[PDB]
Design an enzyme around this catalytic site. Structure first.
Site, PDB file in Angstrom:
ATOM      1  CG  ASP A   1      -1.347  10.454  10.621  1.00 11.71           C
ATOM      2  OD1 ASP A   1      -2.588  10.617  10.583  1.00 11.71           O
ATOM      3  OD2 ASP A   1      -0.697  10.207   9.584  1.00 11.71           O
TER       4      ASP A   1
ATOM      5  N   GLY B   1       0.841  -1.193   0.000  1.00  8.42           N
ATOM      6  CA  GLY B   1       0.000   0.000   0.000  1.00  8.42           C
ATOM      7  C   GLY B   1       0.870   1.235   0.000  1.00  8.42           C
TER       8      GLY B   1
ATOM      9  CB  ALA C   1       1.423  -6.022  10.311  1.00 13.50           C
TER      10      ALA C   1
ATOM     11  CG  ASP D   1       1.792   4.560   8.635  1.00 19.72           C
ATOM     12  OD1 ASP D   1       2.712   4.315   7.843  1.00 19.72           O
ATOM     13  OD2 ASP D   1       0.678   4.024   8.517  1.00 19.72           O
TER      14      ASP D   1
ATOM     15  CG  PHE E   1       7.327   8.859   4.266  1.00 24.99           C
ATOM     16  CD1 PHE E   1       8.097   7.914   3.578  1.00 24.99           C
ATOM     17  CD2 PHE E   1       7.117   8.682   5.633  1.00 24.99           C
ATOM     18  CE1 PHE E   1       8.624   6.809   4.235  1.00 24.99           C
ATOM     19  CE2 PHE E   1       7.650   7.585   6.297  1.00 24.99           C
ATOM     20  CZ  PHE E   1       8.405   6.649   5.596  1.00 24.99           C
TER      21      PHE E   1
ATOM     22  CE  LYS F   1       6.471   1.043  -4.654  1.00 26.30           C
ATOM     23  NZ  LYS F   1       7.205   1.243  -5.938  1.00 26.30           N
TER      24      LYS F   1
ATOM     25  CD  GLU G   1       6.587  -6.508  14.141  1.00 25.74           C
ATOM     26  OE1 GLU G   1       6.844  -5.422  14.713  1.00 25.74           O
ATOM     27  OE2 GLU G   1       6.087  -7.462  14.749  1.00 25.74           O
TER      28      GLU G   1
ATOM     29  NE  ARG H   1      -4.888   8.052   7.923  1.00 27.74           N
ATOM     30  CZ  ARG H   1      -5.673   8.864   8.619  1.00 27.74           C
ATOM     31  NH1 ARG H   1      -6.981   8.637   8.691  1.00 27.74           N
ATOM     32  NH2 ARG H   1      -5.153   9.927   9.217  1.00 27.74           N
ATOM     33  CG  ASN H   2      -1.591   6.073  10.175  1.00 29.92           C
ATOM     34  OD1 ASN H   2      -1.293   5.600   9.099  1.00 29.92           O
ATOM     35  ND2 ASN H   2      -1.882   7.383  10.331  1.00 29.92           N
TER      36      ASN H   2
HETATM   37  C1  LIG Z   1       7.398   1.720  10.446  1.00 28.44           C
HETATM   38  O1  LIG Z   1       6.643   0.777   9.674  1.00 28.44           O
HETATM   39  C2  LIG Z   1       5.432   1.201   9.053  1.00 28.44           C
HETATM   40  O2  LIG Z   1       5.058   2.374   9.192  1.00 28.44           O
HETATM   41  C3  LIG Z   1       4.622   0.166   8.321  1.00 28.44           C
HETATM   42  C4  LIG Z   1       3.498   0.558   7.573  1.00 28.44           C
HETATM   43  C5  LIG Z   1       2.696  -0.379   6.895  1.00 28.44           C
HETATM   44  C6  LIG Z   1       3.061  -1.720   7.012  1.00 28.44           C
HETATM   45  C7  LIG Z   1       4.245  -2.162   7.810  1.00 28.44           C
HETATM   46  C8  LIG Z   1       4.995  -1.178   8.457  1.00 28.44           C
HETATM   47  N1  LIG Z   1       4.371  -3.520   7.799  1.00 28.44           N
HETATM   48  C9  LIG Z   1       3.385  -4.026   7.055  1.00 28.44           C
HETATM   49  O3  LIG Z   1       3.201  -5.274   6.804  1.00 28.44           O
HETATM   50  C10 LIG Z   1       2.501  -2.989   6.512  1.00 28.44           C
HETATM   51  C11 LIG Z   1       1.319  -3.175   5.650  1.00 28.44           C
HETATM   52  N2  LIG Z   1       1.052  -4.458   5.351  1.00 28.44           N
HETATM   53  C12 LIG Z   1       0.026  -5.050   4.702  1.00 28.44           C
HETATM   54  C13 LIG Z   1      -0.090  -6.423   4.892  1.00 28.44           C
HETATM   55  C14 LIG Z   1      -1.111  -7.144   4.276  1.00 28.44           C
HETATM   56  C15 LIG Z   1      -2.002  -6.489   3.426  1.00 28.44           C
HETATM   57  N3  LIG Z   1      -3.057  -7.229   2.830  1.00 28.44           N
HETATM   58  C16 LIG Z   1      -4.014  -7.793   3.776  1.00 28.44           C
HETATM   59  C17 LIG Z   1      -3.228  -7.378   1.515  1.00 28.44           C
HETATM   60  O4  LIG Z   1      -4.191  -8.012   1.107  1.00 28.44           O
HETATM   61  C18 LIG Z   1      -2.277  -6.746   0.514  1.00 28.44           C
HETATM   62  N4  LIG Z   1      -3.038  -6.089  -0.575  1.00 28.44           N
HETATM   63  C19 LIG Z   1      -3.682  -4.840  -0.107  1.00 28.44           C
HETATM   64  C20 LIG Z   1      -4.592  -4.303  -1.217  1.00 28.44           C
HETATM   65  N5  LIG Z   1      -3.814  -4.062  -2.453  1.00 28.44           N
HETATM   66  C21 LIG Z   1      -4.744  -3.626  -3.510  1.00 28.44           C
HETATM   67  C22 LIG Z   1      -3.072  -5.271  -2.884  1.00 28.44           C
HETATM   68  C23 LIG Z   1      -2.186  -5.795  -1.746  1.00 28.44           C
HETATM   69  C24 LIG Z   1      -1.891  -5.103   3.229  1.00 28.44           C
HETATM   70  C25 LIG Z   1      -0.863  -4.381   3.843  1.00 28.44           C
HETATM   71  C26 LIG Z   1       0.553  -1.991   5.156  1.00 28.44           C
HETATM   72  C27 LIG Z   1       1.151  -1.266   4.114  1.00 28.44           C
HETATM   73  C28 LIG Z   1       0.497  -0.145   3.599  1.00 28.44           C
HETATM   74  C29 LIG Z   1      -0.734   0.242   4.138  1.00 28.44           C
HETATM   75  C30 LIG Z   1      -1.320  -0.482   5.185  1.00 28.44           C
HETATM   76  C31 LIG Z   1      -0.673  -1.613   5.689  1.00 28.44           C
END
Ligand SMILES: COC(=O)c1ccc2c(c1)NC(=O)/C2=C(\Nc1ccc(N(C)C(=O)CN2CCN(C)CC2)cc1)c1ccccc1
Length: 287
Positions: A149, A19, A95, A167, A23, A25, A93, A153-154
């Site tokens: 924040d 996602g 999640a 985040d 700041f 990707k 990490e 979502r965070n």
């Molecule tokens: C300091 O560290 C951080 O700040 C930080 C921030 C985010 C993440 C992280 C550390 N560590 C993770 O694992 C994170 C995410 N992990 C994730 C895991 C599984 C999924 N799932 C369930 C999917 O199904 C993936 N799927 C989502 C939808 N699109 C369209 C296709 C891909 C989605 C995100 C995620 C990242 C972006 C936003 C929301 C969460």
């Protein structure tokens, strides 16, 4: 360029986009011999977009700086960084369930869903999620940090459905005077901001408490959108005149009382995170 954190770029393999963060990707990845764990470890990687602004680079650096210092079961972990042989990468990490907002929205349609097995949710599970977050925030507040924040979502949902605050790009230290103040306009969405942050640009642990109250509302609505149908510019007048979000459908009187306390106009009349944790503990036990 910190030896304790720098990780060999050749040992990191990037995969699919998970996602986008405030700041940049976030991508899924794998890291070979990460902190001396044999073999590969699945991680996430935070990077900048090609069209990044200086603010976005500064936010990446500030998240790195904060997360080097902090260590808690309910704060997402920093494992390392690659700064030398190309684009700046933060290794963090993974999640597995994604964001709390995502996870709760999925529970509306998937698995056994919300009842009142990681896909089965009860109101006890929801109080637990909030309690875990409050514990993380209590620690961050002890460390004189203000997240700024806090929002569904965070928060991330990791293995075992463990809450991980994430985040940290907008987070700030409040070493002296216990406040962070900025002359310029902030980049936190209006709908999560405390009234004094919105009007006065003042951020403290007590404004994180306000945001925590909005997060509680998001939790009980299973990923609902705050102030639904109200344009963000209207919040200035709405909050000033003492209006607050109404009690949601599957929210107890006690849960709503806690929300309202978090949104008190006067910041010192709001609960501190230690007391919120205590309030949630007594809710979980009175069942
Ligand atoms: C300091 O560290 C951080 O700040 C930080 C921030 C985010 C993440 C992280 C550390 N560590 C993770 O694992 C994170 C995410 N992990 C994730 C895991 C599984 C999924 N799932 C369930 C999917 O199904 C993936 N799927 C989502 C939808 N699109 C369209 C296709 C891909 C989605 C995100 C995620 C990242 C972006 C936003 C929301 C969460």
């Amino acid at each position: 360029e910190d030896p304790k954190w720098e990780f060999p770029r050749k040992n990191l393999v990037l995969g699919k986009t998970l996602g986008e963060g405030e700041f940049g990707k976030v991508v899924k990845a794998t890291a070979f011999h990460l902190k001396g764990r044999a073999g590969y470890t699945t991680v996430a990687v935070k990077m900048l977009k090609e069209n990044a602004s200086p603010s976005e680079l500064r936010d990446l650096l500030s998240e790195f700086n904060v997360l080097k210092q902090v260590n808690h079961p309910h704060v997402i972990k920093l494992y390392g960084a690659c700064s030398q042989d190309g684009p700046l990468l933060l290794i963090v990490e993974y999640a597995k369930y994604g964001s709390l907002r995502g996870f709760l929205r999925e529970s509306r349609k998937v698995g056994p869903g919300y009842l009142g097995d990681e896909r089965a949710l009860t109101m006890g599970d929801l109080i637990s999620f909030a309690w875990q977050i409050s514990q993380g925030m209590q620690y961050l507040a002890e460390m004189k940090l203000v997240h700024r924040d806090l929002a569904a979502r965070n928060i991330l949902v990791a293995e075992g459905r463990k809450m991980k605050i994430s985040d940290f790009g907008l987070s700030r230290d409040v070493y002296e005077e216990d406040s962070y103040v900025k002359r310029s306009q902030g980049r936190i969405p209006v709908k999560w901001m405390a009234i004094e942050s919105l009007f006065d640009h003042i951020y403290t642990t007590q404004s994180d408490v306000w945001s925590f109250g909005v997060l509680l509302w998001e939790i009980v609505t299973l990923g609902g959108n705050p102030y639904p149908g109200i344009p963000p510019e209207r919040l200035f007048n709405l909050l000033k005149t003492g209006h607050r979000m109404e009690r949601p459908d599957n929210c107890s009187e006690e849960m709503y009382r806690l929300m309202l306390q978090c949104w008190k106009q006067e910041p010192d009349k709001r609960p501190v995170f230690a007391d919120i944790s205590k309030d949630l503990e007594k809710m979980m036990v009175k069942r």
